[PDB]
């Protein structure tokens, strides 16, 4: 099944679960609150979708026509968010499903954004950089002229097929053509380079978010008692950006990586694998094929014995066929939909915890929200507070020193910070604020999801709990908005 | 086949015909003129397509979701034009094809508009007036928030499933919600009632358009010689298939100029009378009760009237009435396509085989678009036509007549009175209004377009294939507009 | 001298002449009306001057910097008007002087426009059409971003070094980038092709204007009595579009072209020269050299014996040296400033009428005004009125016929129009309206100039009369506007 | 030589130095990296120059015409910044040079602003306050109508010939006439009074910035080893050559940190006292009457103080005080260019010959720009700094101290009172205000810019030639934005 059917079924199950509690526990008459559940019918379909067909010039003087799509799901929050994907396999159904997923993903982590998606039916490898720039600029103009690019309307973001260069082109085009009089013309897109208004810590956002999401659940006694846990052993399937950063952060906190797999052959080592050496080997030449101090493991690493499995790889790696054969007890969905609904039932039968992808990989969205806020503030974070905070800390330490010296009759110096504190003070930067905000958001969302799961007497079915929480959050806004006209 | 295939084939045939002339004797290099023909492949696809799903609340406290579509084809003329259809059988393909047709229809009659189409998947029979009004308000707001309703962007028009009431609702919504600061907020739609800014003569626009289209071609001796007829009206015979507003007005206007209507058809049984049928009596009978069934002085003709012997046939009815099956059986030598797409390409080939003149629907029924353009201009002018000129023209005419009278009196020693206008001219002077100006403009446009189409057909050595001539003319105009604008940006 | 000093001296003399009469008989206090003449010193200087320096990328991957200037003289009328020149010898002084001249030229013919001028320091012969288009687009963007291109602010027009292609590019740029939401985005520039929103009869505007200007003065008995004239003989120097059209219309109206000059050798024929044959010969190959039925005249045609001389050619053809040697009683300044002030005094000494260039060549400005009005109306002229007028004419003729038939017992047919009337009815178009309006404007301006010249006891010094009229017209607007606060 | 040629030469030398390293591996095709250096030639010229001539009515019923100029250099950052000058010597060249300098000055201290300058050829001493106000209003309106005043476009700042009254008038005019619908209409100008939206600590901005700039370099042991001095202000002495705002504040802040002033100069006779001079007493004496002439406990030094033996010299005075003639006679090893370009290019060679450090004026006197940036941010935030955080911080501090007290009492178990802060910390808590935040941000910006300049100077193997290092750093920063922007077509 495709993602469209999966998300439709997930939303239907969530609505069916939540409606019974929603009718009574939240309403004010005539028992017609069930007739109000038509609000749930409003949320499901996508509000807007637009199809574009525009020409470009091409370097050899021949004209070409390019097709694109842009879907906006919900306008219950004014600014919409979503990525742009350059691929020949794009379609209206895919962008609609991804836009629908985006609203729930944003609502889970309490980000006041809508949902949107964009796709251009193009092959990046078949074009020159000049042609790509022309395509991006024309696409930006076409979206702007119909109200789909505005800083207070819709804020596009990069995807796996595009990069910060395209975002820089989009921002320049919008700020030079349409948003000339707008004071916030540079907040119309996210993912820009630092020189163009980007934010620090954007590269390692998703891996850090995945690490925090795993840490929040792994430290709860109630779930570990059910799972029989609490050292740490994890296996990552995929060595992209997300997998690399997730492995780095997990290993930094005292976890051992047993196996690493990719599209080609895998790697296995009981003693553990150093993330830095593996990264250097991968950057040196091609893939990790031939890494020293590592054995060429045969077969799928999914069945390998480990405490944590991170399938940060291609679509629906886990299916009903290989579901009963896995040995990992905790699965952290690093990618979008690595498991099939049948596999979910199989895992739930044998009490296998599955952390939903709707919550785990929202670090990128959170950092995009932070970058949008920074662009609106017209100033980097912490520029006006670092020196003042340092002075306050030194004053506090001196106060403690003087108070202690005034009680015990000479040599007492509490004013010396620790080595880590001294490094934190000296190397203060903007990315510290971003990381702290990301950790806070992940912790709060994990707590909310746990409470929602407890409320509805759900077990290890965290996906349904997250969907129910998102549906409740959206329904509250629709209900209290009054519905215009 | 569906209309999408027919319009795609027509455009492909027109482009193939025109490219040969368009490459060589058009412009100023390196023989890259065959490489700039890519401009043509820019014209074919639609530029923008949008689909909406919006909620309303029913009268019984229940909620519902309504789906709609809006397609804009070309932006070479930034005011886009198109109708809105309320029907449960709408689809993206239909609105795309209709917008593509509207672009060429506007280009043929030299109307500086683009092409657009809108459809709402709702049947009007299952809703009350309040629910319909709420649906129109929400649809207008949704289109406004995305840039599809603006007076300088897109001007919707009524269709067969909607009326002036919906247009009034849309105009009020736009003028009260989004276009509050716009001085031309009431020019966002056409077809409004006269009290809301409508134009006179809008009801009978298509009938006059069809009548003028037939009259222009029927007076050309070159084509009459080919068809073996006599030029001009009089002693002519025409049969109308369908008795809507278009057919009724066309029959009235044809009978006014000395034509005899022999048969009138409809969904139910038909009519036949060699002596002719009076349009006024038939209209009164139809308005009295139900259909024209049982009309006095009318033999209940049996069988399809399409094969009846007549000089002119007007298929103003449902789509593709004429097919390859009944093509070799018709007896009419001139066919005037009142409606959109009443014939199939095989039927057109059969007619060309037996030199049967077919007036294209792309040009014949374009009077409504012209009158909508005039209404848009009137809304922009903030004044009705002729308000500041009628009395001045009357004074000038009287001064001219008095001058002639005095000059004639200066030559002869009795009393001459040339200052007396004719009865027709006196009635014209007394009853001066806006509809006279509207009808004169419509006639002028229909004459110019017909002359241009005939010249284009002569240029490309085409015979009675006026459809391809019209398509070639429209493609030439659109290509010129693109080419002289610099294209690249 | 330079034209900056020329226009400064002309304005100073005009203001000196006006001041005395203006003070006494214009207002209803303390005799301090003479202190209000500071209003005059407000009119003289230019209001705004802008200098632009923008980059482009050449065809061979090279970057270049292009400089330009735009001067706006007066804002007493909101829409400013002026040409754009592409030349390597442009300067701030030249554009300022031309902008100052434009205000008076517009005010003479009662056109509610200001004055402006633009220059770009580029040689058009060293650039590819793609490079020229890029330069035009960037220049339009730079002018738009600072408020110098708006349809209600400033409307550029073509010049000798630019054509309709540049104005098509300008209109496309403004309608696609800045004036997207403007309903009159295509009225921001004048001179566009007919397909892009141009007007008919624009090509032959200046020739008709010159012909009408000459005709209006040549039919005034008072001036011809002073000159002792009143068939017609004229000599034109220069064979541009202006000279060609002027010769065509003059020959059509019964005048004889004795000689024709150009940059190369001249042409002389006592029997006259046919404009059509000469135009065909010139278009066939190169110049008019070798034209049959044309003696190769040797020497300067300026001293040739003719009743009318039209110096529609290069700058400053008449000076104090050759002034006494001319034999033309009437000189019609087709071009901008072909006569020196000393030559003006010499001509005034021996009764030589000099029709000012300020009034003679305003046909282009008038037709530009008409095109701007047409673009604002969103419809061509006469589309809704031709059929109604034809019906009214036929009804009037039929009424006369029927009235004449009531007096006599066979058949009278007044319904038949004359051949010229029938041709006029059949070939009705927009150019007829444009030419009619141009003729009306020229006649009214000529009458106003004659009245102003008579009022101030001026003789054949029509230049000062025109300057006085323009100064009075501008001063009236400033005086009644309240001079703001 | 005028500043135009000096800045042209500085930019040319910086570009020539940076080109070789920039073409190389520092940036990532057919070896066209050397051919893209046209980007550099894009940066040098000014983008926009505007000249105005507007009328006013004088007090005695007479009209006058006033001319002015406004130059904008770079638009790589949308908000442009620059001062407005009132003097009858302004010209296009001067405003162009100052606007060009402003871009580099802003880029050095990492302030996202462009460069601009305005000059009105007027004499303030010959006009009544009413006439000056009318001139300011008309000038503001003229700049507004052409897009030169906008809060997101261009933000003017005061200068030596204009005060806060003019900027209050400008802000009132913009908020009342053009920016009526703008929510940030009061952010269109800086330097306003506090009651009109000004910021605290604006008066002493430049002196504090100069002090911080000197202090950053003084404590760097690597440079003091070359100069042969010792780090710290302990035994240092300074000679100020001016008594403006900059000179008044700089010496007060230096004395506050243990620096002794041995001499003070001005446009008149000097003062010499080895024991030191009190800034407060001298300021009070000057404010009491006239100049510092006749100050008690101050020997009336005769001669040029530029040659006086001192550790550091601060020439905050008129143009180009230091020249080639004076260069060999200076006994100060460190020169802090407090003013705007007081050193000729020739004298720099002599200073480099015998190891005399010259802190560039581009970086030293940039504190005013930073404080203007902070004021612009405050106007955008619609709230003063620290209003919602001052009370929370003291609660946090008291909770921390109480926690320490409780832990210490638990460990031992009579009474320990760590809760008491120090006297300076208690005074800081009691008198918390916005100027503390402003000064903290200024110090942070100066420290970061000094570190960046040192790193850039070390990178290109430059010695004590800090001016070229600063210019190279600014050029690199601007080129980064131009290169990564893609250059719109």
JSON list of C-alpha atoms in Angstrom, two decimals, chain C residues 268-410:
[
{"chain": "C", "resi": 268, "resn": "UNK", "atom": "CA", "xyz": [17.86, 69.98, -57.05]},
{"chain": "C", "resi": 269, "resn": "UNK", "atom": "CA", "xyz": [14.93, 70.05, -59.46]},
{"chain": "C", "resi": 270, "resn": "UNK", "atom": "CA", "xyz": [12.90, 73.12, -60.53]},
{"chain": "C", "resi": 271, "resn": "UNK", "atom": "CA", "xyz": [10.01, 70.83, -61.50]},
{"chain": "C", "resi": 272, "resn": "UNK", "atom": "CA", "xyz": [9.81, 69.25, -58.04]},
{"chain": "C", "resi": 273, "resn": "UNK", "atom": "CA", "xyz": [10.58, 65.82, -56.62]},
{"chain": "C", "resi": 274, "resn": "UNK", "atom": "CA", "xyz": [8.03, 63.04, -56.18]},
{"chain": "C", "resi": 275, "resn": "UNK", "atom": "CA", "xyz": [8.08, 61.82, -52.55]},
{"chain": "C", "resi": 276, "resn": "UNK", "atom": "CA", "xyz": [7.06, 58.26, -53.45]},
{"chain": "C", "resi": 277, "resn": "UNK", "atom": "CA", "xyz": [9.73, 57.73, -56.12]},
{"chain": "C", "resi": 278, "resn": "UNK", "atom": "CA", "xyz": [12.41, 59.31, -53.92]},
{"chain": "C", "resi": 279, "resn": "UNK", "atom": "CA", "xyz": [11.41, 57.15, -50.95]},
{"chain": "C", "resi": 280, "resn": "UNK", "atom": "CA", "xyz": [11.48, 54.02, -53.12]},
{"chain": "C", "resi": 281, "resn": "UNK", "atom": "CA", "xyz": [14.91, 54.93, -54.50]},
{"chain": "C", "resi": 282, "resn": "UNK", "atom": "CA", "xyz": [16.27, 55.60, -51.00]},
{"chain": "C", "resi": 283, "resn": "UNK", "atom": "CA", "xyz": [14.86, 52.32, -49.67]},
{"chain": "C", "resi": 284, "resn": "UNK", "atom": "CA", "xyz": [16.27, 50.43, -52.66]},
{"chain": "C", "resi": 285, "resn": "UNK", "atom": "CA", "xyz": [19.95, 51.11, -51.91]},
{"chain": "C", "resi": 286, "resn": "UNK", "atom": "CA", "xyz": [21.76, 53.50, -49.60]},
{"chain": "C", "resi": 287, "resn": "UNK", "atom": "CA", "xyz": [21.12, 57.22, -49.95]},
{"chain": "C", "resi": 288, "resn": "UNK", "atom": "CA", "xyz": [19.32, 59.29, -52.59]},
{"chain": "C", "resi": 289, "resn": "UNK", "atom": "CA", "xyz": [22.53, 59.76, -54.57]},
{"chain": "C", "resi": 290, "resn": "UNK", "atom": "CA", "xyz": [22.08, 59.04, -58.26]},
{"chain": "C", "resi": 291, "resn": "UNK", "atom": "CA", "xyz": [18.33, 59.65, -58.24]},
{"chain": "C", "resi": 292, "resn": "UNK", "atom": "CA", "xyz": [17.00, 60.09, -61.80]},
{"chain": "C", "resi": 293, "resn": "UNK", "atom": "CA", "xyz": [15.34, 63.38, -62.78]},
{"chain": "C", "resi": 294, "resn": "UNK", "atom": "CA", "xyz": [17.49, 65.08, -60.14]},
{"chain": "C", "resi": 295, "resn": "UNK", "atom": "CA", "xyz": [20.43, 67.36, -60.85]},
{"chain": "C", "resi": 296, "resn": "UNK", "atom": "CA", "xyz": [23.30, 66.88, -58.37]},
{"chain": "C", "resi": 297, "resn": "UNK", "atom": "CA", "xyz": [23.13, 70.29, -56.69]},
{"chain": "C", "resi": 298, "resn": "UNK", "atom": "CA", "xyz": [26.50, 71.62, -55.53]},
{"chain": "C", "resi": 299, "resn": "UNK", "atom": "CA", "xyz": [26.81, 73.86, -52.49]},
{"chain": "C", "resi": 300, "resn": "UNK", "atom": "CA", "xyz": [24.71, 74.46, -49.40]},
{"chain": "C", "resi": 301, "resn": "UNK", "atom": "CA", "xyz": [20.96, 74.33, -50.01]},
{"chain": "C", "resi": 302, "resn": "UNK", "atom": "CA", "xyz": [20.50, 76.70, -47.06]},
{"chain": "C", "resi": 303, "resn": "UNK", "atom": "CA", "xyz": [20.87, 79.68, -49.41]},
{"chain": "C", "resi": 304, "resn": "UNK", "atom": "CA", "xyz": [18.67, 78.17, -52.13]},
{"chain": "C", "resi": 305, "resn": "UNK", "atom": "CA", "xyz": [15.74, 80.35, -53.18]},
{"chain": "C", "resi": 306, "resn": "UNK", "atom": "CA", "xyz": [12.60, 78.89, -51.61]},
{"chain": "C", "resi": 307, "resn": "UNK", "atom": "CA", "xyz": [9.52, 80.14, -49.80]},
{"chain": "C", "resi": 308, "resn": "UNK", "atom": "CA", "xyz": [9.77, 77.63, -46.92]},
{"chain": "C", "resi": 309, "resn": "UNK", "atom": "CA", "xyz": [12.87, 76.01, -45.42]},
{"chain": "C", "resi": 310, "resn": "UNK", "atom": "CA", "xyz": [12.64, 72.95, -43.16]},
{"chain": "C", "resi": 311, "resn": "UNK", "atom": "CA", "xyz": [15.93, 72.23, -41.30]},
{"chain": "C", "resi": 312, "resn": "UNK", "atom": "CA", "xyz": [14.94, 68.79, -40.00]},
{"chain": "C", "resi": 313, "resn": "UNK", "atom": "CA", "xyz": [18.51, 67.56, -39.72]},
{"chain": "C", "resi": 314, "resn": "UNK", "atom": "CA", "xyz": [21.64, 67.64, -37.57]},
{"chain": "C", "resi": 315, "resn": "UNK", "atom": "CA", "xyz": [22.25, 70.09, -34.75]},
{"chain": "C", "resi": 316, "resn": "UNK", "atom": "CA", "xyz": [22.97, 73.80, -35.28]},
{"chain": "C", "resi": 317, "resn": "UNK", "atom": "CA", "xyz": [22.76, 74.15, -39.05]},
{"chain": "C", "resi": 318, "resn": "UNK", "atom": "CA", "xyz": [22.07, 77.90, -38.97]},
{"chain": "C", "resi": 319, "resn": "UNK", "atom": "CA", "xyz": [24.59, 80.34, -37.46]},
{"chain": "C", "resi": 320, "resn": "UNK", "atom": "CA", "xyz": [25.42, 84.04, -37.60]},
{"chain": "C", "resi": 321, "resn": "UNK", "atom": "CA", "xyz": [27.76, 83.50, -40.56]},
{"chain": "C", "resi": 322, "resn": "UNK", "atom": "CA", "xyz": [25.30, 82.03, -43.07]},
{"chain": "C", "resi": 323, "resn": "UNK", "atom": "CA", "xyz": [22.28, 83.88, -41.63]},
{"chain": "C", "resi": 324, "resn": "UNK", "atom": "CA", "xyz": [22.38, 86.91, -44.00]},
{"chain": "C", "resi": 325, "resn": "UNK", "atom": "CA", "xyz": [22.80, 84.63, -47.04]},
{"chain": "C", "resi": 326, "resn": "UNK", "atom": "CA", "xyz": [19.52, 82.69, -46.71]},
{"chain": "C", "resi": 327, "resn": "UNK", "atom": "CA", "xyz": [16.60, 83.53, -48.99]},
{"chain": "C", "resi": 328, "resn": "UNK", "atom": "CA", "xyz": [13.77, 81.68, -47.21]},
{"chain": "C", "resi": 329, "resn": "UNK", "atom": "CA", "xyz": [11.09, 83.94, -45.76]},
{"chain": "C", "resi": 330, "resn": "UNK", "atom": "CA", "xyz": [9.79, 81.21, -43.42]},
{"chain": "C", "resi": 331, "resn": "UNK", "atom": "CA", "xyz": [11.92, 78.73, -41.46]},
{"chain": "C", "resi": 332, "resn": "UNK", "atom": "CA", "xyz": [10.21, 75.75, -39.82]},
{"chain": "C", "resi": 333, "resn": "UNK", "atom": "CA", "xyz": [12.39, 74.21, -37.11]},
{"chain": "C", "resi": 334, "resn": "UNK", "atom": "CA", "xyz": [11.74, 70.49, -37.56]},
{"chain": "C", "resi": 335, "resn": "UNK", "atom": "CA", "xyz": [14.60, 69.42, -35.30]},
{"chain": "C", "resi": 336, "resn": "UNK", "atom": "CA", "xyz": [15.57, 70.53, -31.78]},
{"chain": "C", "resi": 337, "resn": "UNK", "atom": "CA", "xyz": [17.54, 73.77, -31.86]},
{"chain": "C", "resi": 338, "resn": "UNK", "atom": "CA", "xyz": [18.99, 74.31, -35.34]},
{"chain": "C", "resi": 339, "resn": "UNK", "atom": "CA", "xyz": [19.29, 78.10, -34.94]},
{"chain": "C", "resi": 340, "resn": "UNK", "atom": "CA", "xyz": [21.66, 80.24, -32.86]},
{"chain": "C", "resi": 341, "resn": "UNK", "atom": "CA", "xyz": [20.43, 83.30, -30.93]},
{"chain": "C", "resi": 342, "resn": "UNK", "atom": "CA", "xyz": [22.54, 85.59, -33.13]},
{"chain": "C", "resi": 343, "resn": "UNK", "atom": "CA", "xyz": [20.87, 84.08, -36.18]},
{"chain": "C", "resi": 344, "resn": "UNK", "atom": "CA", "xyz": [17.52, 84.79, -34.51]},
{"chain": "C", "resi": 345, "resn": "UNK", "atom": "CA", "xyz": [18.42, 88.48, -34.24]},
{"chain": "C", "resi": 346, "resn": "UNK", "atom": "CA", "xyz": [19.62, 88.52, -37.86]},
{"chain": "C", "resi": 347, "resn": "UNK", "atom": "CA", "xyz": [16.35, 86.96, -39.02]},
{"chain": "C", "resi": 348, "resn": "UNK", "atom": "CA", "xyz": [14.33, 89.44, -36.95]},
{"chain": "C", "resi": 349, "resn": "UNK", "atom": "CA", "xyz": [16.33, 92.25, -38.58]},
{"chain": "C", "resi": 350, "resn": "UNK", "atom": "CA", "xyz": [15.10, 91.49, -42.11]},
{"chain": "C", "resi": 351, "resn": "UNK", "atom": "CA", "xyz": [11.63, 90.00, -41.45]},
{"chain": "C", "resi": 352, "resn": "UNK", "atom": "CA", "xyz": [12.30, 86.26, -41.46]},
{"chain": "C", "resi": 353, "resn": "UNK", "atom": "CA", "xyz": [9.65, 84.25, -39.63]},
{"chain": "C", "resi": 354, "resn": "UNK", "atom": "CA", "xyz": [11.06, 81.43, -37.50]},
{"chain": "C", "resi": 355, "resn": "UNK", "atom": "CA", "xyz": [8.47, 78.94, -36.26]},
{"chain": "C", "resi": 356, "resn": "UNK", "atom": "CA", "xyz": [9.74, 77.69, -32.88]},
{"chain": "C", "resi": 357, "resn": "UNK", "atom": "CA", "xyz": [10.80, 74.10, -32.41]},
{"chain": "C", "resi": 358, "resn": "UNK", "atom": "CA", "xyz": [8.99, 74.07, -29.06]},
{"chain": "C", "resi": 359, "resn": "UNK", "atom": "CA", "xyz": [5.58, 74.05, -30.76]},
{"chain": "C", "resi": 360, "resn": "UNK", "atom": "CA", "xyz": [6.34, 72.55, -34.18]},
{"chain": "C", "resi": 361, "resn": "UNK", "atom": "CA", "xyz": [7.43, 69.02, -33.22]},
{"chain": "C", "resi": 362, "resn": "UNK", "atom": "CA", "xyz": [4.98, 68.26, -30.39]},
{"chain": "C", "resi": 363, "resn": "UNK", "atom": "CA", "xyz": [2.97, 65.81, -32.49]},
{"chain": "C", "resi": 364, "resn": "UNK", "atom": "CA", "xyz": [4.91, 62.89, -31.05]},
{"chain": "C", "resi": 365, "resn": "UNK", "atom": "CA", "xyz": [4.12, 64.03, -27.51]},
{"chain": "C", "resi": 366, "resn": "UNK", "atom": "CA", "xyz": [0.44, 64.46, -28.40]},
{"chain": "C", "resi": 367, "resn": "UNK", "atom": "CA", "xyz": [0.24, 60.97, -29.89]},
{"chain": "C", "resi": 368, "resn": "UNK", "atom": "CA", "xyz": [2.03, 59.59, -26.82]},
{"chain": "C", "resi": 369, "resn": "UNK", "atom": "CA", "xyz": [-0.66, 61.22, -24.68]},
{"chain": "C", "resi": 370, "resn": "UNK", "atom": "CA", "xyz": [-3.33, 59.61, -26.86]},
{"chain": "C", "resi": 371, "resn": "UNK", "atom": "CA", "xyz": [-1.67, 56.20, -26.52]},
{"chain": "C", "resi": 372, "resn": "UNK", "atom": "CA", "xyz": [-1.52, 56.60, -22.73]},
{"chain": "C", "resi": 373, "resn": "UNK", "atom": "CA", "xyz": [-5.23, 57.42, -22.71]},
{"chain": "C", "resi": 374, "resn": "UNK", "atom": "CA", "xyz": [-5.97, 54.38, -24.88]},
{"chain": "C", "resi": 375, "resn": "UNK", "atom": "CA", "xyz": [-4.02, 52.11, -22.53]},
{"chain": "C", "resi": 376, "resn": "UNK", "atom": "CA", "xyz": [-5.98, 53.55, -19.61]},
{"chain": "C", "resi": 377, "resn": "UNK", "atom": "CA", "xyz": [-9.31, 52.99, -21.40]},
{"chain": "C", "resi": 378, "resn": "UNK", "atom": "CA", "xyz": [-8.50, 49.29, -22.06]},
{"chain": "C", "resi": 379, "resn": "UNK", "atom": "CA", "xyz": [-10.15, 49.59, -25.50]},
{"chain": "C", "resi": 380, "resn": "UNK", "atom": "CA", "xyz": [-9.32, 50.95, -28.93]},
{"chain": "C", "resi": 381, "resn": "UNK", "atom": "CA", "xyz": [-10.84, 54.22, -30.10]},
{"chain": "C", "resi": 382, "resn": "UNK", "atom": "CA", "xyz": [-14.11, 54.12, -32.00]},
{"chain": "C", "resi": 383, "resn": "UNK", "atom": "CA", "xyz": [-14.85, 50.41, -31.58]},
{"chain": "C", "resi": 384, "resn": "UNK", "atom": "CA", "xyz": [-18.28, 51.07, -30.05]},
{"chain": "C", "resi": 385, "resn": "UNK", "atom": "CA", "xyz": [-19.17, 54.12, -32.18]},
{"chain": "C", "resi": 386, "resn": "UNK", "atom": "CA", "xyz": [-18.41, 53.44, -35.86]},
{"chain": "C", "resi": 387, "resn": "UNK", "atom": "CA", "xyz": [-21.49, 51.34, -36.63]},
{"chain": "C", "resi": 388, "resn": "UNK", "atom": "CA", "xyz": [-23.82, 53.68, -34.71]},
{"chain": "C", "resi": 389, "resn": "UNK", "atom": "CA", "xyz": [-22.43, 56.72, -36.55]},
{"chain": "C", "resi": 390, "resn": "UNK", "atom": "CA", "xyz": [-22.81, 54.96, -39.91]},
{"chain": "C", "resi": 391, "resn": "UNK", "atom": "CA", "xyz": [-26.43, 54.08, -39.09]},
{"chain": "C", "resi": 392, "resn": "UNK", "atom": "CA", "xyz": [-27.12, 57.68, -38.05]},
{"chain": "C", "resi": 393, "resn": "UNK", "atom": "CA", "xyz": [-25.61, 59.02, -41.28]},
{"chain": "C", "resi": 394, "resn": "UNK", "atom": "CA", "xyz": [-27.67, 56.64, -43.41]},
{"chain": "C", "resi": 395, "resn": "UNK", "atom": "CA", "xyz": [-30.82, 57.56, -41.47]},
{"chain": "C", "resi": 396, "resn": "UNK", "atom": "CA", "xyz": [-30.15, 61.27, -42.03]},
{"chain": "C", "resi": 397, "resn": "UNK", "atom": "CA", "xyz": [-29.63, 60.75, -45.76]},
{"chain": "C", "resi": 398, "resn": "UNK", "atom": "CA", "xyz": [-32.80, 58.66, -46.01]},
{"chain": "C", "resi": 399, "resn": "UNK", "atom": "CA", "xyz": [-34.71, 61.34, -44.09]},
{"chain": "C", "resi": 400, "resn": "UNK", "atom": "CA", "xyz": [-33.53, 64.00, -46.54]},
{"chain": "C", "resi": 401, "resn": "UNK", "atom": "CA", "xyz": [-34.52, 61.73, -49.43]},
{"chain": "C", "resi": 402, "resn": "UNK", "atom": "CA", "xyz": [-38.03, 61.12, -48.10]},
{"chain": "C", "resi": 403, "resn": "UNK", "atom": "CA", "xyz": [-38.54, 64.80, -47.27]},
{"chain": "C", "resi": 404, "resn": "UNK", "atom": "CA", "xyz": [-37.49, 65.78, -50.80]},
{"chain": "C", "resi": 405, "resn": "UNK", "atom": "CA", "xyz": [-39.82, 63.13, -52.27]},
{"chain": "C", "resi": 406, "resn": "UNK", "atom": "CA", "xyz": [-42.85, 64.75, -50.59]},
{"chain": "C", "resi": 407, "resn": "UNK", "atom": "CA", "xyz": [-42.56, 67.91, -52.72]},
{"chain": "C", "resi": 408, "resn": "UNK", "atom": "CA", "xyz": [-42.38, 66.33, -56.19]},
{"chain": "C", "resi": 409, "resn": "UNK", "atom": "CA", "xyz": [-44.52, 63.74, -57.93]},
{"chain": "C", "resi": 410, "resn": "UNK", "atom": "CA", "xyz": [-40.09, 60.87, -59.80]}
]
